[PDB]
Amino acid sequence: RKPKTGILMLNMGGPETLGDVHDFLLRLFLDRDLMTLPIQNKLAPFIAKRLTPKIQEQYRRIGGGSPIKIWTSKQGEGMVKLLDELSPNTAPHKYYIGFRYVHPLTEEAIEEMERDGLERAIAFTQYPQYSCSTTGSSLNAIYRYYNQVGRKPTMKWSTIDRWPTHHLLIQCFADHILKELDHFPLEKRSEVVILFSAHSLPMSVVNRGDPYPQEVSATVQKVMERLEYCNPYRLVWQSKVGPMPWLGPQTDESIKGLCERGRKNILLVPIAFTSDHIETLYELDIEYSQVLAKECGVENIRRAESLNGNPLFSKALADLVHSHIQSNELCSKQLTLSCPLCVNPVCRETKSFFTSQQL
Amino acid sequence: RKPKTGILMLNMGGPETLGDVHDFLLRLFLDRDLMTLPIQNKLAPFIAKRLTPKIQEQYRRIGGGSPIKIWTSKQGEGMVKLLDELSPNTAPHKYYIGFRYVHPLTEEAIEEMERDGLERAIAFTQYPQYSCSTTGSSLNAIYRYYNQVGRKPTMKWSTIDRWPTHHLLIQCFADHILKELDHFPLEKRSEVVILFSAHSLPMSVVNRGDPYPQEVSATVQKVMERLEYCNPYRLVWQSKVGPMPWLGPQTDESIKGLCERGRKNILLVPIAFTSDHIETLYELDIEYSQVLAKECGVENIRRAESLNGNPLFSKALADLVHSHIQSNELCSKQLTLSCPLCVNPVCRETKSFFTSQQL
Ligand SMILES: C[C@H](CCC(=O)O)[C@H]1CC[C@H]2[C@@H]3[C@H](O)C[C@@H]4C[C@H](O)CC[C@]4(C)[C@H]3C[C@H](O)[C@]12C
Ligand SMILES: C[C@H](CCC(=O)O)[C@H]1CC[C@H]2[C@@H]3[C@H](O)C[C@@H]4C[C@H](O)CC[C@]4(C)[C@H]3C[C@H](O)[C@]12C
Ligand SMILES: C[C@H](CCC(=O)O)[C@H]1CC[C@H]2[C@@H]3[C@H](O)C[C@@H]4C[C@H](O)CC[C@]4(C)[C@H]3C[C@H](O)[C@]12C
Ligand SMILES: C[C@H](CCC(=O)O)[C@H]1CC[C@H]2[C@@H]3[C@H](O)C[C@@H]4C[C@H](O)CC[C@]4(C)[C@H]3C[C@H](O)[C@]12C
Ligand SMILES: C[C@H](CCC(=O)O)[C@H]1CC[C@H]2[C@@H]3[C@H](O)C[C@@H]4C[C@H](O)CC[C@]4(C)[C@H]3C[C@H](O)[C@]12C
Ligand SMILES: C[C@H](CCC(=O)O)[C@H]1CC[C@H]2[C@@H]3[C@H](O)C[C@@H]4C[C@H](O)CC[C@]4(C)[C@H]3C[C@H](O)[C@]12C
Ligand SMILES: C[C@H](CCC(=O)O)[C@H]1CC[C@H]2[C@@H]3[C@H](O)C[C@@H]4C[C@H](O)CC[C@]4(C)[C@H]3C[C@H](O)[C@]12C
Ligand SMILES: C[C@H](CCC(=O)O)[C@H]1CC[C@H]2[C@@H]3[C@H](O)C[C@@H]4C[C@H](O)CC[C@]4(C)[C@H]3C[C@H](O)[C@]12C
Ligand SMILES: O=C(O)c1ccccc1O
Ligand code: FES
Ligand code: FES
Numbered sequence: 001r002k003p004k005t006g007i008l009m010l011n012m013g014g015p016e017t018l019g020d021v022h023d024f025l026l027r028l029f030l031d032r033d034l035m036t037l038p039i040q041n042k043l044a045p046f047i048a049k050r051l052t053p054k055i056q057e058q059y060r061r062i063g064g065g066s067p068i069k070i071w072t073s074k075q076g077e078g079m080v081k082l083l084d085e086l087s088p089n090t091a092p093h094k095y096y097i098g099f100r101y102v103h104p105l106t107e108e109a110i111e112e113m114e115r116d117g118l119e120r121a122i123a124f125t126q127y128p129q130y131s132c133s134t135t136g137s138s139l140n141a142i143y144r145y146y147n148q149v150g151r152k153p154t155m156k157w158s159t160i161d162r163w164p165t166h167h168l169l170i171q172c173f174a175d176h177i178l179k180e181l182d183h184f185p186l187e188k189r190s191e192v193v194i195l196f197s198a199h200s201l202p203m204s205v206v207n208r209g210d211p212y213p214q215e216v217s218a219t220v221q222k223v224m225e226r227l228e229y230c231n232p233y234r235l236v237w238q239s240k241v242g243p244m245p246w247l248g249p250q251t252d253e254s255i256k257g258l259c260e261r262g263r264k265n266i267l268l269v270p271i272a273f274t275s276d277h278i279e280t281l282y283e284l285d286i287e288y289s290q291v292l293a294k295e296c297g298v299e300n301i302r303r304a305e306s307l308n309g310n311p312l313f314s315k316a317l318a319d320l321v322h323s324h325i326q327s328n329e330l331c332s333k334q335l336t337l338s339c340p341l342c343v344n345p346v347c348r349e350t351k352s353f354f355t356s357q358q359l
Numbered sequence: 360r361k362p363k364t365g366i367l368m369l370n371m372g373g374p375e376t377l378g379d380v381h382d383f384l385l386r387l388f389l390d391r392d393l394m395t396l397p398i399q400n401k402l403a404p405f406i407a408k409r410l411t412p413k414i415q416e417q418y419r420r421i422g423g424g425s426p427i428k429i430w431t432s433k434q435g436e437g438m439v440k441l442l443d444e445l446s447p448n449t450a451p452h453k454y455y456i457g458f459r460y461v462h463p464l465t466e467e468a469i470e471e472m473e474r475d476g477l478e479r480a481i482a483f484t485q486y487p488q489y490s491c492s493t494t495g496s497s498l499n500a501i502y503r504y505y506n507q508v509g510r511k512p513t514m515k516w517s518t519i520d521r522w523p524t525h526h527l528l529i530q531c532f533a534d535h536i537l538k539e540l541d542h543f544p545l546e547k548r549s550e551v552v553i554l555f556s557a558h559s560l561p562m563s564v565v566n567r568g569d570p571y572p573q574e575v576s577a578t579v580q581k582v583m584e585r586l587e588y589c590n591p592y593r594l595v596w597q598s599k600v601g602p603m604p605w606l607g608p609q610t611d612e613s614i615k616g617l618c619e620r621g622r623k624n625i626l627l628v629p630i631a632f633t634s635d636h637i638e639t640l641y642e643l644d645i646e647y648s649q650v651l652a653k654e655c656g657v658e659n660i661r662r663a664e665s666l667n668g669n670p671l672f673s674k675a676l677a678d679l680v681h682s683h684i685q686s687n688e689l690c691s692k693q694l695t696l697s698c699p700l701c702v703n704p705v706c707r708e709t710k711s712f713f714t715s716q717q718l
Contacts, residue, residue: 165580193696203562207607209616214594217576221524232696235573245604248566249700257568257699261707337552337591340616341608348620 003094005083006118006155007321008109009076010138011126013099014066014277018056020102022048025055027101033137033344062281071275071308072097072126078314079321087322090120098138106141114154122321123159123354128169129198129215129272130162132339133205136347143350157357158330160320164215165222168316173219173271174226175312176304180267181231184300188265192231192300193258195251196220198272199279200237203245209339213247216272223271235271239279255288259296266293268303274313276306330357362453364479365472365514366442366680368435369465369497370486372458373425373636377415379461381407384414386460392496392703421640430634430667431456431485437673438680445681449479452680457497465500473513481680482518482713487528488557488574488631489521491698492564495706502709516716517689519679523574524581527675532578532630533585534671535663539626540590543659547624551590551659552617554610555579557631558638559596562604568698572606575631582630594630598638614647618655625652627662633672635665689713 015024028034029044037043059065076095083093096113098106113121123142125135139159146153163169177194184192198216206213220235238251249257251268258266268289270280284303293301307313331354338347374383387393388403396402418424435454442452453475457468472480482501484494498518505512522528536553543551557575565572579594597610608616610627617625627648629639643662652660666672690713697706 165584203604203607207609209593209595209608209613211593213572214576214579217573218580220573221577221580225524229692232692234568234570234696234699236568236699245562248562249568254568254699257701261697261699261701263696263699333588333591337593337622338620340554340593340595340613340620340622342616342620 001092003092003116003118005087005090005093005120005325006113006116006122007076007079007083007093007095008098008106008113008121008123009072009095009126010098010106010123010135011068011072011100012134013102014068015059015102016069017065018059020065021056021059022052024102025051031100031137033140033346034133058278058282061286062278066277068275068277069097069099071306074309075275075314075317078311079317082315082318083321086318087325090325093321094118100138100141106138107145110142110145118155120325121153121155121157122324123157123161124317124321125159125161126274127272128162128166128274129164129212129219130334131201131205131212132210132342132344132347133201135161136350139354140346140350143353144346146353156359157354158324159335159354160324161332161335161354162211162215163320164219166316166320168312168319169274170219170222170226172307172310172313172316173223173269173304176307176310177223177227177267177269180302180304183302184265184267188300190231191263192265192267193263194231194233194267194269195254195258196223196233196235196269196271197238197251197284198235198270200240200246200248200250202240203247206247208341208343211334211339219271231267238283251284252288252292255292255298255301256296259293259298264297264299266298266301268301270303270306274307276308280306328359330354330359360451362451362475362477364442364449364452364481364684365475365477366435366438366452366454366481366483367457367465367468367472368431368454369457369482369484369494370427370431370459371493372461373427374418374461375428376424377418379424380415380418381411383461384410390459390496392499392705393492417637417641420645421637425637426635427458428456430665433668434633434673434676437670438676441674441677442680445677446684449684453477457500459497459500465497466504469501469504477514480512480514480516481683482516482520483676483680484518484520485633486631487521487525487633488523488571488578489693490560490571491569491701491703491706492560494520498713499705499709502705502712505712515718516713517683518694518713519683520691520694521570521574522679523578525675525679527671527678528633529578529581529585531666531669531672531675532582532628532663535666535669536582536586536626536628539661539663542661543624543626547659549590550622551624551626552622553590553592553626553628554613554617555582555592555594555628555630556597556610556643557594557629559599559605559607559609562606565606567700567702570693570698578630582628590626597642610643611647611651614651614657614660615655618652618657623656623658625657625660627660629662629665633666635667639665687718689716689718
């Protein structure tokens with residue numbers, strides 16, 4: 001049977017092999033939704049070239065590439081299997097991967113959805129908490145694709161643009177946390193401090209009104225409420241680079257600070273993504289857990305397993321799509337409000353692209 | 360009958376009259392938990408004298424003083440009336456006001472609780488979301504009182520140190536929001552943007568691990584869930600002073616930014632306060648809503664009424680205390696963890712003061 005409903009799973013992506021690092025960086029430095037640079041068309045290739053060896057080495061240290069596409073594919077397959085059974089009125093469903101900066105690109109996926117002759121298309125961000133830099137850029141890329149090719153869409157579009165507190169997402173995190181807690185020595189379990197760690201943002205982005213940290217905070221509170229506040233926690237922020245001010249405290253400084261203050265049993269939780277990648281496999285596991293924490297005299301540090309192939313997570317995704325379809329929503333109410341200090345004219349046009357869709 | 364259980368309601372306080380401004384400022388600038396100054400014992404009275412006229416002027420513009428004591432008293436009376444019926448085994452209950460920087464001072468309230476020969480004493484912060492600079496300083500003040508007086512307490516202490524998502528608090532906020540939405544022109548209701556506004560913090564405090572912004576965000580998400588995301592929103596931050604970096608976006612810049620971008624119907628919600636203060640009556644209502652908003656060409660701007668005398672809020676307070684009593688809790692799990700980058704030796708001692716209390 002011909003596919004009727006397409007689910008476009010949006011994520012930034014990561015280089016599958018060390019060879020893919022350069023083009024990954026190049027596409028990213030060319031993204032003007034993500035960042036504006038002087039003489040950008042010339043600086044982008046240069047910075048990409050400059051950072052490539054260092055970034056290649058990081059991927060080498062985790063096994064030679066990003067597992068994002070594998071996890072995204074498995075999650076997508078599980079989601080589709082479920083949707084075909086619980087939403088027959090919209091079946092057959094098909095998932096499409098649209099990575100922002102690596103193949104398959106958002107544009108390539110849209111091309112394939114069109115050729116497949118879908119009746120309905122759903123832009124399903126794989127970031128549960130909205131940031132204009134991630135989800136925003138991915139949604140902008142969809143509007144721009146149609147603008148650039150000078151044609152209207154042939155499919156009815158809509159977006160699931162955020163889902164920071166979906167009860168099944170919450171259950172998966174809480175589940176993974178309890179599992180990791182079971183892996184601490186029993187005598188230390190109650191003493192464990194939970195560090196929720198989300199990718200930081202530079203303060204220039206926070207200060208223009210980015211909804212990300214408030215939504216991340218909502219996810220954290222929902223998870224802790226489900227865990228009945230069994231352990232104390234803090235939300236901290238990782239991956240800052242460069243000399244500018246970013247939102248803190250930093251995950252690395254917090255780990256060190258905790259240890260210096262006698263809290264030497266720490267559970268790291270990657271609360272802002274749904275599968276592994278460099279930020280967990282290299283930064284958290286190698287840099288912070290193996291190296292930093294050893295230097296600080298930690299007793300036990302562990303990290304909750306990423307959601308990855310958890311079947312309940314596939315159920316979360318299917319439920320999200322199912323409710324979205326049944327409610328006839330075009331986008332969240334939140335998408336109808338741009339940042340109070342937004343300075344990117346495409347944000348408004350992208351917002352309108354979704355809110356104005358024919359039903 | 361002699362009071363059995365005392366509920367110490369902790370808040371910063373504000374000057375009751377213009378004459379109270381100087382000593383208010385003086386006590387504040389002397390609080391080393393709040394801030395460290397060079398030659399502090401000399402600079403504190405000077406800065407107090409220096410700011411006094413300007414601050415007096417602000418209070419004059421709202422009617423000549425802070426209403427915090429009036430509202431705290433009414434809330435406390437309502438709370439106690441309920442508590443005597445909810446929990447007769449701990450009755451008679453009595454409330455005490457412990458303001459940090461004005462009479463009646465935290466220390467004066469403790470002296471009175473001690474004289475009243477209470478069996479049970481509860482440090483009940485009136486800030487729903489914990490900040491080390493507010494609730495932290497108030498709890499520190501209690502520990503310091505006993506330490507400075509050289510005597511152990513004759514009462515069994517515990518604390519309700521935060522309550523950012525208490526279901527009745529959330530209902531009060533949602534109710535006041537709906538009531539305010541009803542006051543906009545019907546044709547503009549759906550177009551209204553909600554700006555949740557909380558007091559900002561300097562980034563130096565955020566970056567040391569202050570739990571405040573994450574808890575404020577939790578309160579915001581709970582309120583919006585209850586409202587069924589009826590309007591789009593942003594959490595923004597007010598009251599920054601001085602040249603240093605603070606958490607943004609600023610409420611004032613956000614109001615102007617919304618107006619320049621065509622969102623001219625705005626509902627302000629003071630989400631981190633439970634009664635009126637200079638921050639609502641002067642900063643939001645006069646500076647932003649009367650002056651700034653008119654300059655920006657706003658169509659409609661309103662502020663949700665503070666919780667103040669809502670009898671449902673009194674019910675929230677009673678329910679909190681009642682649940683605290685029933686659970687035999689000494690403090691939240693969160694209090695057992697100080698900031699990862701805390702540099703105040705007293706924080707740990709105060710934490711221990713509460714966690715170690717005889718039951
Ligand atoms: C903070 C920023 C997004 C915020 C923004 O729009 O300004 C994020 C999103 C993708 C990130 C980049 C990508 O993860 C790729 C690179 C990863 C390296 O480990 C650091 C630099 C690196 C180039 C990252 C810098 C920065 O953290 C980026 C750009
Ligand atoms: C000033 C500009 C950022 C301005 C903006 O974002 O619009 C920054 C961002 C990236 C910077 C460049 C990149 O870091 C790459 C180069 C790094 C070298 O150390 C300096 C030149 C170099 C070419 C930088 C020049 C300048 O500091 C840049 C271009
Ligand atoms: C570290 C990296 C490359 C620097 C180099 O080694 O030459 C530089 C190049 C572009 C920079 C980014 C861009 O200038 C865009 C962002 C600008 C914000 O002010 C800080 C974060 C921000 C995301 C920058 C972080 C970091 O300094 C980047 C990613
Ligand atoms: C009781 C002891 C010394 C107090 C004293 O000298 O009077 C104090 C000093 C440091 C404290 C420890 C550190 O603060 C680190 C931990 C903090 C946790 O909240 C309790 C256990 C924890 C391990 C603390 C237990 C206990 O209160 C300690 C060990
Ligand atoms: C350096 C210090 C802040 C650092 C700290 O918190 O210790 C700041 C905070 C308050 C400042 C003081 C107050 O603003 C009052 C005075 C203001 C005058 O403009 C300068 C001297 C003056 C006396 C200031 C000196 C200095 O800039 C102070 C003392
Ligand atoms: C942000 C800060 C607490 C955080 C901290 O400094 O660590 C808050 C708590 C009480 C605030 C102060 C009090 O509200 C009293 C003053 C009110 C005036 O409108 C501004 C200065 C003023 C002196 C405030 C400055 C600042 O916002 C303070 C000091
Ligand atoms: C504005 C006020 C008085 C300035 C003056 O009249 O001289 C000054 C004096 C002390 C200052 C505060 C203290 O220095 C403590 C805090 C220091 C942080 O770096 C900024 C906020 C911080 C809370 C300061 C805000 C503001 O600049 C204050 C409150
Ligand atoms: C349709 C019109 C411009 C048409 C265009 O040139 O393509 C756009 C431009 C500015 C838009 C308005 C502004 O963006 C402000 C409002 C934004 C809200 O999300 C919708 C209503 C709202 C009032 C918008 C309605 C409509 O989409 C407007 C009026
Ligand atoms: O946690 C933060 O530091 C923060 C900052 C802005 C908005 C919401 C937040 O939780
Ligand atoms: S930057 Fe947030 S909507 Fe444009
Ligand atoms: S500053 Fe937060 S516990 Fe000390």
